[PDB]
Each structure stands twice: as C-alpha cells, then as structure tokens.
C-alpha cells in the first residue's frame, strides 16, 4: 500500500545501484516525466543520496505533480520547487486501491491558510478556523476537519482512477556520491592490442595470463617506473600482464 | 452566521474594466476558498473565478480571457477586478464561500449586475 | 458538465426529483442549490445527499450510477425555484443548465 498524500513516505536510497532504466523502459508507468535529467542519462550519474516519495492521488491530479503547477495537491499535500531536477513516475492503482463503497482510507488536504512550501509536510488534523471565533477543537460553524479522506470505486473515469506516484528526487551534498547508476561491461579478450578500462584505470596494451600473485588486498601492479604491469580482472579475480604494442 | 454583501458599479462600457468587491461579518477572506459565480441574465449559472484560500487563482477559459481575483485580508474584502468587458458580460455577479467538497458553497451574496453597454 | 431535465410543474402533494448526468461520476461530490428567481442560489443538498439546517425535511438527496438526484417529499407551490447542481471538476466549478420547478 502507497500512503495518502498529507502522508509521505520518503525511501531514503543510499550506498546502491540504481538502475533506474528498468523503471523507464518496461512501460508498467503512465506518466514517466524526467526534469533537468533524460530518463536515459540518469544512469551515467551518481547521487549522495536518491529519495522517493510515494503517494496516492486521483488521475485528474496527476498532472499536478509538477515544479510548475498549482491545485489542491500542488499547493496543500505535495508541492515541488520550482527548480526541481528528478523523476515523476505514476500509474494507474485501480485494481487495488478501488474498493466497492469506496476505499476510504485516502486523505487530501482540503484546507490550510496558506501554500505549503517545497517539499514541506504538514501532517496535523488540527480543525481549521475559516472565520469569526477560533472554536477549536470542534467542528462547526468556521471550524473544518483539513482533510476530506475521499475512497476510490471500481467505477470511475480515468479521472477518477486512483495513481500511485513516486517521486525520484537527486542531491550531491558535498559527499561521495553512493548511489550510482550500473556500470556496464564488455567481454574480456586476450592476446590481442586492445583499448582498456578496468575499474577506473585505462590505456592501450595486450594482455596476458600472469603469474603474479598479487594480496586478496591490491588491485593494480606496477613496474619501477610506476607503469602498469598487470591488472586484476574485476569479475574473475586474474591477474593480467600487460605489455606495449609494438 | 456570515453576512456577505456585494459592490459594484452602474453601467460600464465594452473595453472597459470594473472593480467589484464583496466583505462579509464572521468570515477571514484569507481562509477561505472565494468564488465570483455569474448568473446570466435570464440565461443562467456560470462559475468564473476562484481564489484559494490562502494560495492562486483560476478562471473559466470558457467563460473569459482574463479577469482578475485578489483578496485584502486586513479588511477580509475579495475584490474581483473586471476588464476586457464584452456586452456579453451583463450579468448577475455573486459573492460566494466555497467549501468544495466538505459543504459547497455554504455562503453567498445577494448579488450584483454589472451592465455593459 | 451536469445535464438536466429541463422542468416539474404542477407538483403539488407530491414527490418532486431532479437529476444531473454527467461523466462526473456521482462519484464527483453533488451538490444542489435552490435559486429562487431574483435571490442567490441556496444551498440545499450538499455531499450528494445531506441537507443543511435551515431548509425544510422534505429535502434529501440520492444518486446513481454518473447521476446525482433531488429529492423533495412533497411539493409545494411555494417550492418554485430554478434548482441547480454543481460539480468541483478540476478546479474548474460548473453548474448545470437549471431546471424549472413549481
């Protein structure tokens, strides 16, 4: 279950690889809306840390999630900055978020006297004063319960379709970034010149079985003149000698 | 339990602009979502603005270009800036309070026709 | 937007009901409104079917499928009134045409 919006769940994603492609290829998503990113390109960065926000809302305030839109989500329950970079991803819950009677466990926020701020939540269900008297504590005349708590049914227009979204959002905070996007690989040939990069060291050579042994410990070797003599194969623990092309 | 009480002008001309203004007894105009609902003369209902409470504004594109909503919440008066007029645009204009979908609109005015000729 | 039937008229001692269709599902919340000509609509049915204070017990409201309903147990000659219903769709507020009742 995705929570209600005036309710987030923030993942907090931290030390991973995120292949965030396999989101945006399998086409399971209606909305896959990428700002200041190419859904594509996500994968060549790295961030300190990636979070996502989920929650529910109805197809109609799907288009609300966004840096440049205002409505009753935009500016109540989930407001996103102006200058924000990541993610929208939604899609259509019907089939298990509709409920025969409703499935009445969906909360707006139906009143404030004021715009929440960027990313900002505000959780109480502090009754709200429109007028007059304060009447705290009570609903009544000038005095409103925030939140509505609408339910989903089965029949519905699209509109009216319950969405789960989740929110990607991406930050560099003067940190090692640890969650990366997948690094990819090619097949490993021997005996032949050949453009390397093994981790993050590269050069053009050919490479060979070794008969070094290196400690479980280092990953390069080197020759007095500090030139890399061999290198350990990521994947399969080898070491390879390297030597010139004529 | 509210007193809203509209006002406005007399007879305008096409292309002009007109400022109305509503104010009501009990009620924070900054604490509420605000309606200007038209009823067309003898045609009949059509919403035209919303101010949120405490937020933006949105208009009938379907209705008009752009009109303006504004609140002033020292003195809880709604304002509804007028311009752009058509003869099209004579109409009944009400005061209204909209509490969406917790109690519509609980609160209106007695309203007001702005005659454009 | 919200259709209606255009009138009831010689309704007296009887029920009276109006209905609204719309692709707004009755799911979209309706609310009605009492317009007696030359006054401001009245609020009389809101949350679909709930009455507020300060109108008579003869008004409840009902709805189907796409349609929300008024219900007046009795109809009165002093009923007359151009009722209308309402429906928050999108941020956008439209109301139906109206429907004539006496």
């Known amino acids: 279950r995705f929570a209600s919006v005036y309710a987030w769940n923030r993942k907090r994603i931290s030390n991973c690889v995120a292949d965030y492609s396999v989101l945006y290829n399998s086409a399971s998503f209606s909305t896959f809306k990428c700002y200041g990113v190419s859904p594509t390109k996500l994968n060549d960065l790295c961030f300190t840390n990636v979070y996502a926000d989920s929650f529910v809302i109805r197809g109609d305030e799907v288009r609300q999630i966004a840096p440049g839109q205002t409505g009753k989500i935009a500016d109540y329950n989930y407001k996103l900055p102006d200058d924000f970079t990541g993610c929208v991803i939604a899609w259509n819950s019907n089939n298990l978020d509709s409920k025969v009677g409703g499935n009445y466990n969906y909360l707006y926020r139906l009143f404030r006297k004021s715009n929440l701020k960027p990313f900002e939540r505000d959780i109480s269900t502090e009754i709200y004063q429109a007028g007059s008297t304060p009447c705290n504590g009570v609903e009544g005349f000038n005095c409103y319960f925030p939140l509505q708590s609408y339910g989903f049914q089965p029949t519905n227009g699209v509109g009216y379709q319950p969405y789960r979204v989740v929110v990607l959002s991406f930050e560099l905070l003067h940190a090692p970034a640890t969650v990366c996007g997948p690094k990819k690989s090619t097949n490993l040939v021997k005996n032949k010149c050949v453009n390397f990069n093994f981790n993050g060291l590269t050069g053009t050579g050919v490479l060979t079985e070794s008969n070094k042994k290196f400690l479980p410990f280092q990953q390069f070797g080197r020759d007095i003149a500090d030139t890399t003599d061999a290198v350990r194969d990521p994947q399969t623990l080898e070491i390879l000698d390297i030597t010139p092309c004529s | 339990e509210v007193q809203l009480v509209e006002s406005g002008g007399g007879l305008v001309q096409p292309g002009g602009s007109l400022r109305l203004s509503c104010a009501a007894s009990?009620?924070?105009?900054?604490?509420?979502?605000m309606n200007w609902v038209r009823q067309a003369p003898g045609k009949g209902l059509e919403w035209v603005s919303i101010?949120?409470?405490?937020?933006?504004?949105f208009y009938a594109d379907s209705v008009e270009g752009r009109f303006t909503i504004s609140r002033d919440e020292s003195k809880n008066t709604l304002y509804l800036q007028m311009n752009s007029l058509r003869t099209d645009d004579t109409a009944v204009y009400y005061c209204?309070?909209?509490?969406?979908?917790?109690?519509?609109?609980?609160?209106w005015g007695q309203g007001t026709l702005v005659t454009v000729s | 937007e919200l259709t209606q039937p255009l009138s009831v008229s010689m309704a007296l001692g009887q029920t009276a009901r109006i209905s609204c269709g719309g692709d707004?599902?009755?799911?979209?919340?309706v609310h009605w409104y009492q317009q007696r000509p030359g006054q401001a609509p009245v609020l009389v049915i809101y949350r679909d079917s709930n009455r507020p204070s300060g109108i008579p017990e003869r008004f409840s409201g009902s709805k189907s499928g796409n349609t929300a309903t008024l219900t007046i147990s009795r109809a009165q000659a002093g009923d007359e009134a151009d009722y209308y219903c309402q429906v928050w769709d999108s941020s956008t507020v439209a109301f139906g045409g109206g429907t004539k009742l006496t």
């Open positions: 101010i949120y409470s405490g937020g933006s504004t």
């Open positions: 209204a309070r909209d509490l969406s979908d917790y109690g519509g609109i609980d609160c």
């Open positions: 707004n599902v009755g799911s979209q919340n």
């Open positions: 009990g009620l924070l105009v900054s604490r509420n979502y």
